Design a binder for this molecule. Sequence first.
Ligand SMILES: NC(=O)c1ccc[n+]([C@@H]2O[C@H](COP(=O)([O-])OP(=O)(O)OC[C@H]3O[C@@H](n4cnc5c(N)ncnc54)[C@H](O)[C@@H]3O)[C@@H](O)[C@H]2O)c1
Ligand SMILES: [K+]
Ligand SMILES: [Mg+2]
Ligand SMILES: [Mg+2]
Ligand SMILES: [Mg+2]
Ligand SMILES: [Mg+2]
Ligand SMILES: [Mg+2]
Ligand SMILES: [Mg+2]
Ligand SMILES: [Mg+2]
Lengths: 161, 58, 70, 109, 39, 51
Amino acid sequence: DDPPPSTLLKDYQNVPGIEKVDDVVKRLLSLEMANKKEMLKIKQEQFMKKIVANPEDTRSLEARIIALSVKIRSYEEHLEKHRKDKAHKRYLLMSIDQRKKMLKNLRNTNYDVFEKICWGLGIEYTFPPLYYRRAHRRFVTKKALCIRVFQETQKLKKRRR
Amino acid sequence: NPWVQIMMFKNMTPSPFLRFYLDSGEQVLVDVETKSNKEIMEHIRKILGKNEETLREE
Amino acid sequence: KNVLKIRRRKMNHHKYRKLVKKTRFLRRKVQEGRLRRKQIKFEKDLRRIWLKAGLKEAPEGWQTPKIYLR
Amino acid sequence: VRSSVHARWIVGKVIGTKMQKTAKVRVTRLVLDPYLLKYFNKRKTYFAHDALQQCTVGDIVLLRALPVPRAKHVKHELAEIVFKVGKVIDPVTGKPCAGTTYLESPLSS
Amino acid sequence: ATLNQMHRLGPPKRPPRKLGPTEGRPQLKGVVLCTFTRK
Amino acid sequence: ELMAWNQAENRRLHELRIARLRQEEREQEQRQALEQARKAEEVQAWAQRKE
RNA sequence: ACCACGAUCAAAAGGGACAAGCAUCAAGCACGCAGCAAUGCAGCUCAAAACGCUUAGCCUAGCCACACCCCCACGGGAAACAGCAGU
Ligand SMILES: NC(=O)c1ccc[n+]([C@@H]2O[C@H](COP(=O)([O-])OP(=O)(O)OC[C@H]3O[C@@H](n4cnc5c(N)ncnc54)[C@H](O)[C@@H]3O)[C@@H](O)[C@H]2O)c1
Ligand SMILES: [K+]
Ligand SMILES: [Mg+2]
Ligand SMILES: [Mg+2]
Ligand SMILES: [Mg+2]
Ligand SMILES: [Mg+2]
Ligand SMILES: [Mg+2]
Ligand SMILES: [Mg+2]
Ligand SMILES: [Mg+2]
């Protein structure tokens, strides 16, 4: 869920007396009167506060993962409307691959932070396939038949025994 | 030592170290931080290397 | 650069395209016969599998799809 | 005399945990190329009995030969986990670490 | 090629030697069918 | 005997490591104080401009 | 030794190692695991070359394989020099 449009900008949230200003100023300094980038910044700050131990450290692997996750969400939202944007499709796929690499490194280095990142960002880590080969029609049909034949063999063996 | 399984690991711990596994199940840990390669060779030869007497006997 | 090689490539390609045009109809029959034989080979391999497994017939509900006919 | 299994003590990385109480471990040895005279890694897969199913994909484990094979491919048992994946404890100092950085400082104790 | 590539490919694999008209034999016996001349 | 000697060498190296780490911690404390003051100054300027 | 304690030698079984060419042979199709069993899980091998075709006796104090053919030899084809000499 996006931050409410009434939320203040990241740069105008700790200003002293920001709650003592007029409603018009509040509207002007809110996400309603800003581009999508400020709203993505607010998502990034929220995720950092919710997940990482030190929200100020943007140099940790977890912080980079959070930032790239926000960017990936932005790319996906763009591509829902812009179906034929090949450049942004490339950017989305590349960002997904980079996040997978960072998640692999985090899993190899800090498993607790890896679990926290996976739970907080709703990321379901998947292990890469062992082999990269085309699944053409012949192979697919043959594999389906082999599975069926194994099932029938199991049934027959159960009946015999 | 052709039959000894040598395996390497990179950037897993803050400091370098060697670990030897023996047939009895005992483990020998050798800290090698701040040590030169020649020093590491001399140390491992001293602690787990056959002495020259055994080699001449063989 | 080798302009003879590129001119040789041009002559070889142009001669080849003349041959396929001349024998386009004979080629189609050869291709369709080859596809028929290839489908038959695929079916024979599948049948070999379920015969070696032990089943006297194909798996129940299985029908070998035609994966090569356009 | 204690076992009929050739490989007595071996160290590997766990690459599979889909079998019940059995871990598929990848073991690398150094083999000399006869022509280039350079040492390259040669891989072998071992099945190790894991009674408690405490092995995770990617962790470095030590396997000890069984007195006899308990199955066709299971000839070893999990003696210990040398390095838990993402939960490494520095053997030199005994402190938790994340890569080359200390999660807990040695001085703190 | 790098050392890794050389290790991967392995030693050069020389194609088998082509057999000549005598098929790798010193001589062959034959029956004359016809005699003629060529230019 | 050799194993005991190796363990003693490990303990000696551990003591040296502790000394070096303490020195590094002191230097880190000093530097971190300096950069923390600089970050505080930058934050103050940022806040003034926003106000 | 023979009284065995055991040495020497060496089968079957278990673990490991082990020729060449072709990837225009790229997928194999049950090739795994756990349980006393009942049974459960869906797994196992493979571009670090599985599966497959072709070639070849080998790593020579020697070793491996074959002993007319059907791998084997109850059985069948059939009537055997790949022992020496010889044709
Ligand atoms: N074939 C695989 O699925 C695979 C899996 C892991 C790693 N690799 C590595 O990729 C390199 C190329 O291997 P190759 O010459 O035998 O393939 P190749 O070029 O000869 O093509 C055969 C198959 O390997 C795939 N392949 C090709 N290049 C790959 C790559 N970089 N990574 C993964 N798959 C690839 C192809 O998709 C194809 O299905 C090797 O170093 C190998 O270690 C390959
Ligand atoms: K025979
Ligand atoms: Mg034997
Ligand atoms: Mg290839
Ligand atoms: Mg061809
Ligand atoms: Mg032959
Ligand atoms: Mg004869
Ligand atoms: Mg016979
Ligand atoms: Mg004779």
